[PDB]
């Protein structure tokens, strides 16, 4: 019976909530109240990359912390040399509605995807001279929102059809399918060991999936609206999610519950992108008020404000060595702060 | 090294000139979004002009227009609709005849949501009302009534500036003008000058849709320039 199943699910939810309540004896804020604040954080726009024609949605730093990739609505995927500001590559796209991009850890490939429901893979290291389309993925029934490279052969993608897909590049087929979300999955983050990944959808919940097992392990429901950003802590034990309710929230995999909420009264605009510093002390979040906020991840204190962008901030990334932070916005410019 | 630096500079300048040419091409073309229901009959409209997203390229008076359809996307459109905020216009398709569900009310709610969106406040909407012949024949038959869905239709009065087509009885003209006035009220509720609505009456056999869209886009761009010079 449907009613019996609903009652059983409700009882299970009550049991899980009671277990979480019993497992929570102290809050992170009062435990961290004894440490000194990081103080005011001042960052200047060290670099300003120009050349895109339309708004930029996504960017991804390279493992060398020097080359980055950006995707814009003009059908352009531009690979930038951050050190010298010179453009390294400019790949035209068949579909101009790109909404995500990824850069391979080896640096030989880049990923693309958008409203075409296609996750194209471009090979940078071509013997014939310039970048050409390498692989085509045509399995998702919804728009691609995020994609990340596990290696040169396996990729993970999130789509608007409430499902995630683990693809094998050579075969071009869905090696694994992750289902369970009830809303459009907007972002995914890869754990440092590349064994687990967290995905946030438009249902105020974040789901943790095992790459090898292909099944959902934990579900976190603390947000009030759609989650637009997600990112692990530097260690594979916590992750931060920014939502449309103008709040960011920190969740611990082991605790399986909320840790800390970053929000302010004057902030009434949703968060588009979040990221952590190298040590995880600073949490950088891009907002819809044309500004980015750097919070203290341990004290929920607004450490700094970056206000260089004149339009909505769409993407934000931190280098592997944590030297600089790059912000892309709905204007035509990328910014690099240090 | 100096050699690698100069090679990088040469690659950068080649990319820059290619991007300049592509910028000229991009500014030459005008992008439009197309939106409507399944029963709204936008397929015949596309055929009049003429996968994840469908692209249609057409040249009018040596001006390139790129129309983008909804494609294979779910009904939840609160996320991907933000992409089409810089487009020249959003074409909205409404089946005016629609008798299973109150599709007209759903279309009105969707139009209100699009109009009131914060990211779509600067985007103009061109409204098209199809199934004009179906609405006319269902009004003539009298088996289907609009007063049940809209009780204020009984008290509605045909505007004095209405220009009905020849050979058309006043009943269908009044019904279609009330339907249009609903959208006019929704559009005039908010957004006084940021963006404008351009309703039109069209049928499955009409061929003036191209010229109407061209003229509406020209008017939209002219109004955008005047606003920039604060002349309105």
């Amino acid at each position, epitope marked *: 019976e449907l009613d019996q199943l609903r009652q059983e699910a409700e009882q299970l939810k009550n049991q899980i909530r009671d277990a979480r309540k019993a497992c929570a004896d102290a809050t992170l804020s009062q435990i961290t109240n004894n440490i000194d604040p990081v103080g005011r954080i001042q960052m200047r726009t060290r670099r300003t990359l120009r050349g895109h024609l339309a708004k930029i949605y996504a960017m991804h730093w390279g493992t060398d912390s020097r080359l980055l990739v950006s995707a814009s609505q003009d059908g352009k995927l531009i690979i930038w040399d951050s050190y010298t500001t010179n453009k390294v590559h400019a790949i035209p796209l068949r579909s101009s509605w790109v909404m995500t991009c990824a850069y391979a850890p080896s640096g030989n490939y880049v990923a693309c995807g958008g409203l075409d429901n296609i996750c194209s893979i471009y090979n940078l290291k071509t013997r014939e001279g310039n970048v050409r389309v390498s692989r085509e993925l045509a399995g998702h029934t919804g728009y691609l929102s995020c994609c990340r490279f596990l290696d040169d052969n396996q990729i993970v993608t999130s789509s608007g059809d409430t499902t995630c897909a683990l693809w094998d590049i050579e075969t071009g087929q869905q090696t694994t399918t992750f289902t369970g979300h009830t809303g459009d999955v907007m972002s995914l983050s890869l754990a440092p060991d590349t064994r687990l990944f967290v995905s946030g959808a438009c249902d105020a919940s974040a789901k943790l999936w095992d790459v090898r097992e292909g099944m959902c392990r934990q579900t976190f429901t603390g947000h009030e609206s759609d989650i637009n950003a997600i990112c692990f802590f530097p260690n594979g034990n916590a992750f931060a999610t920014g939502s*449309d309710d103008a709040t960011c929230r920190l969740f611990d995999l082991r605790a399986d519950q909320e840790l800390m909420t970053y929000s302010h009264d004057n902030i*009434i605009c949703g968060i588009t992108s979040v990221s952590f510093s190298k040590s995880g002390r600073l949490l950088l979040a891009g907002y819809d008020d044309f500004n980015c906020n750097v919070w203290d991840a341990l004290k929920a204190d607004r450490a700094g404000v970056l206000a260089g962008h004149d339009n909505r901030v769409s993407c934000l990334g931190v280098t592997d060595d944590g030297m600089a932070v790059a912000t892309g916005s709905w204007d035509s410019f990328l910014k690099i702060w240090n | 090294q100096r050699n690698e630096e100069k090679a990088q500079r040469e690659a950068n300048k080649k990319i820059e000139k290619q991007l300049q040419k592509d910028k000229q091409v991009y500014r030459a073309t005008h992008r439009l979004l197309l939106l409507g229901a399944g029963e709204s009959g936008k397929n015949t409209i596309v055929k009049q002009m003429r996968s994840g997203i469908f692209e249609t390229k057409f040249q009018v008076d040596k001006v390139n227009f790129h129309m983008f359809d909804v494609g294979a996307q*779910r009904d939840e459109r609160r996320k991907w609709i933000q992409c089409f905020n810089d487009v020249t216009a959003i074409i909205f398709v409404v089946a005016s005849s629609s008798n299973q569900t*109150n599709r007209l009310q759903a279309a009105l709610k969707l139009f209100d*949501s699009i109009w009131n969106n914060k990211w779509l406040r600067d985007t103009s909407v061109i409204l098209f009302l199809n199934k004009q012949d179906l609405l006319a024949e269902k009004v003539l038959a009298g088996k289907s009534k609009i007063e*049940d869905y809209f009780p204020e239709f009984a008290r509605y009065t045909t505007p004095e500036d209405a220009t009905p087509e020849p050979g058309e009885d006043p009943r269908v003209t009044r019904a279609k003008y009330f339907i249009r006035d609903e959208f006019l009220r929704i559009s005039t509720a*908010s957004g006084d000058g940021r963006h404008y609505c351009y309703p039109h009456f069209t049928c499955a056999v009409d061929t003036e849709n191209i010229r109407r869209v061209f003229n509406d886009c020209r008017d939209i761009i002219q109004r955008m320039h005047l606003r920039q010079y604060e002349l309105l």
Partner: nanobody
Framework: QVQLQESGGGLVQPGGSLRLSCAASGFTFSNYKMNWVRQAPGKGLEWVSDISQSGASISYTGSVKGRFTISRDNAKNTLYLQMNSLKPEDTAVYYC?????????????????????RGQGTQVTV
């Protein structure tokens, strides 16, 4: 966790009155615009009524305009729908829906299937 619970539905003779209650939890009720929608048997989801955050802006569909009333209580974090002069065509499953984002005048895809911020609904038979 955001959740909406609907209650008060039941069998009512034609021309009667009914009261539908929506209890909200997991979010700030006063920061969102609330909606009432219905699904008739063999029919798709359709919007019925909506009420703004403060209750100043209230709108109804034309089918039930002049017979249905919608109200909200932010102190009790609840929503009420008063039904008068009910008709057999009103027999449906009624759902209480919340707008996806707060402080937004627009409200997208509340009548979409598998909406994340919609309650289980209650059956009303006339």
């Amino acid at each position: 966790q955001v959740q909406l619970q609907e209650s008060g539905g039941g069998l009512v003779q034609p021309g009667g009155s009914l009261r539908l209650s929506c209890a909200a939890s997991g979010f700030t009720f006063s920061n969102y615009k609330m909606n009432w929608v219905r699904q008739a048997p063999g029919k798709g989801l359709e919007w019925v009524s909506d009420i703004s955050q403060s209750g100043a802006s209230i709108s109804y569909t034309g089918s039930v305009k002049g017979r249905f009333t919608i109200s909200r209580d932010n102190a009790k974090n609840t929503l009420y729908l008063q039904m008068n002069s009910l008709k057999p065509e009103d027999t449906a499953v009624y759902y209480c829906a919340r707008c996806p984002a707060p402080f937004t005048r627009d409200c997208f895809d509340v009548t979409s299937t598998t909406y994340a911020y919609r309650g289980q609904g209650t059956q009303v038979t006339v």
